[PDB]
Amino acid sequence: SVRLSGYCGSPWRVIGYHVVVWMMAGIPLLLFRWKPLWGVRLRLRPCNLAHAETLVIEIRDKEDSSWQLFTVQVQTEAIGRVLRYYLFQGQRYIWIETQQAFYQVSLLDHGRSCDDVHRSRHGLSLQDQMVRKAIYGPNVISIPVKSYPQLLVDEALNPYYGFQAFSIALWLADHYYWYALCIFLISSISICLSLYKTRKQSQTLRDMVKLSMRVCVCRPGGEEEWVDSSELVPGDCLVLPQEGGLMPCDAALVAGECMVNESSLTGESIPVLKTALPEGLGPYCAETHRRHTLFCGTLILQARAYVGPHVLAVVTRTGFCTAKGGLVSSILHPRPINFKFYKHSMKFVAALSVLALLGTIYSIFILYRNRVPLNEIVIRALDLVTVVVPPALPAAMTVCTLYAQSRLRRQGIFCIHPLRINLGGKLQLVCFDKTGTLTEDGLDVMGVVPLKGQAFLPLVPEPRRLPVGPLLRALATCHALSRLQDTPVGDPMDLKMVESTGWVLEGTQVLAVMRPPLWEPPPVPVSVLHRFPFSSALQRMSVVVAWPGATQPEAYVKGSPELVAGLCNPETVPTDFAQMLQSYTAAGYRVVALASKPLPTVPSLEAAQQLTRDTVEGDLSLLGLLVMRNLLKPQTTPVIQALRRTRIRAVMVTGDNLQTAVTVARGCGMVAPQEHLIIVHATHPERGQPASLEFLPMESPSRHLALSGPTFGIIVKHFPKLLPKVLVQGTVFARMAPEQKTELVCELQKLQYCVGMCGDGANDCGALKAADVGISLSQAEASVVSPFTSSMASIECVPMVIREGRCSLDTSFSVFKYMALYSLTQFISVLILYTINTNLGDLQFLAIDLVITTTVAVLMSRTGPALVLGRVRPPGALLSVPVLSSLLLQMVLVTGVQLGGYFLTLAQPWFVPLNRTVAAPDNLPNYENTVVFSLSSFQYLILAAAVSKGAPFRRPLYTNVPFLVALALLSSVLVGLVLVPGLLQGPLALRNITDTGFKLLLLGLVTLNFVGAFMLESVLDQCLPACLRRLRPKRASKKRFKQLERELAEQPWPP
């Protein structure tokens, strides 16, 4: 369905439109452009696809008419005859000239036969390499880093900077130099900050998504160790490192076995066994099989070759085509951030432009009736447009976020993109990773069972509360420990077990001498007669152990429960061993087994110690079992309950097993004991029968759902109507692929849920960018992509960023309300003066613009977040009855007092009118200017104090002493100005008033409007929402998640 079109034109015609916009640089274009789509469509000069140096791709969703617009450069390269390559949306769409056909990177994706992959065990020197490299492109992730000119162009293409620049020109023209310099300086430094941040962001990501590992190849001639880095071709075969080898390219393993750490994919420290592709004739690609594939970014811990000379793999995916490349494409090209407040602030500024344009018509007529010069009419009419749309408005709202950023830093949460703190305020749902976020990134021994009798014994809770005997020794001598500088090294679970015991690790074959903690209530510090390894097939290690007791030594063994019991004799094995095994596995806890065979072998003799491995691992007694598991964290259980009390929904998005995810979720408090969990599983589609959504009730001592990654896939692909019902009710998503996690967050925010994500890192990076609020608990990798970063490795950050966000959103509303009110009060005063051939003089505008507004705007933004989180959430709607009625009624009182002041001044018998002939600036002192200025001066001070509500989301206003001190000092200067004959009246060009009565009446009008303003906010706060409930009590939200919740409450989904 993509709309792909070719392009060419006359060079003079392209230069002509370059004269129209490229000379302009676009900044006038958008100043004259609502949106570029109309311009974009045919700005470019069209042709056939071949002629096209740039190809317009307009991708349509047929169902929703989602006609997204793109324009993409044509790559021309010679293999030996030029082939046409198009780098669309990152990925390579390859055009064959002969068939006039666009083809994707899935060139051979179909017909990747299991046997065919097996056949390609050797790759040709040049004749395959060069052509394959040309067709598929190079094996590296090449993110282009944008130049400061290109960045400056697109940042400066924002319309508000263009309005600020126009504003700067009119200020410069009308001699308003001081304030203009402040506006210019604030603008310029914000642009510099923005460009630096955007470059730095790209620079670290480009650095981070790069790997320079010198590697071998399997060309039949060419097998040179470290032959190349990025030169790998998708078809090529490779030899692996024997130990500790990071995988550069996604490749199927042709022969040998491997043990690999899939940290990138599963978020697991444990290894995964990898086996050779099993020989088959069908279209048996490694992708679908998913056991015979080494995915890119993963570490090979151990490589082993037995059936051939060395381990062998064939490449499958390279560069942007690999899954890691999919994640890089996911973090790039990001979905635009859509918020109600942000659009509504722009819409309110649009309404101000209409009101300003209407204002200019009144200004132009009244100035012509006033009979001013032609030049004056253009300057003063445009000046009024700059008053109605306040040019410092963006800078004001930044001050709110700038304070919160600093507060968060002191608590230890580090924040790039300060504006995103506000998004925190509106979070309804927060997603959480399990391993490293909510569950401690490590396995700890829950306990061991003794097996004193033939039947199993009750479990021992604490290994530190040790009983001396064969179990004590079995823990001591069952170890795979290496040597570092007074430090243990090897399998972390085995390393943990040696610490659990309290033992210390320091004959001709004796290694790693084993000692007690040296506390006494017979400690018998033990030695190892022989040691036999943990082979992947074996699933077990047998360690023969000699005590200093003058007794013949016995073999003590550790392994998997199945294998250990299978090798153990059935008389020794318990009857319910399998049932206990089943209980711990199904419960999700790890099951490991300890067993022993007495050895007729002589002490200290190498010959006697040496045996056949299977001879040593022959017929054994079951010594007992060991159980280890993740322990949640200290702070996890508290926070999740507080999130539940707040009614901010909690979702577990993990890469682990479903059964494990359930038990952590139950312990965590994602699902309460009274609450009911339903397992939802759906099979793959068949020609014979459709894919069946099998819903299973899960019994246990707000009914919600549990998914697997495959099941989630089957719901999105084969049940699109039901997916909404699953997303609004699902609480635990298990075995989720790194891409699938981002698609969950994308589909959640499609339903009009605001979405946050908490992440350990490297599996969740895609989501951390994709989510509205992304908090990385790692200092590594995730930090680069994540909007926010924490140092505490805890869910504890989420409460703090919620609280700060709620406060900052409330502060941002108040600062907007004030700046809008400030705009309109100056518009009311300047209109009333303009009719009389007067205007608020220069340095009277400056005082208002700098010392009153910038002080109160930057001191009302200081208020800290409220101590307790509450069920009620801040409003999102800047275009709402509550805000608009507040602005309207406050402005009616503002207008009323100012007009009341004027007509009162006119009435008094000492009153004298002005010249009304010479210009508004030339009449420097006048009673009308003095009374308008004096009354207006206080109203800016008053409004700032009233609009700040404080308590439910922020600290109490009476706590914020500097704002009250600043208000008091500014109140003292303004009351001083009117009451005293002014030393400062000379600078501001005011007229001192003899009549104390009239001065006290003018204070009378001010003190009235203070009480009026402070009351009316309280009246609307306590009445207007209640009065709305009377008008409509059943106003259901357009938010789709709310509608689906209402629907589910009426008709419940499969009960």
Ligand SMILES: *[C@@H]1O[C@H](CO)[C@@H](O[C@@H]2O[C@H](CO)[C@@H](O)[C@H](O)[C@H]2NC(C)=O)[C@H](O)[C@H]1NC(C)=O
């Ligand atoms: C407003 O100011 C103007 C300018 O000072 C006044 O007009 C001047 O009046 C004096 C007489 O004292 C003449 O010498 C000037 O020639 C006049 N100038 C102009 C430009 O006409 C005007 O009288 C003042 N308005 C009022 C009501 O007194």
Ligand code: BEF
């Ligand atoms: F490592 Be997490 F549980 F996806």
Ligand SMILES: [Mg+2]
């Ligand atoms: Mg994890």
